């Protein structure tokens, strides 16, 4: 989505 | 699917 820590990889 | 993705991170 952004920036985090969880890669939001699809 | 990780070519032509957005991938990102979140949290």
């Known amino acids: ?10 | 699917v990780g070519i032509g993705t957005p991938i990102s991170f979140y949290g």
């Open chain 1, 1 to 10: 989505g952004g920036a985090g820590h969880v890669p939001e990889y699809f």
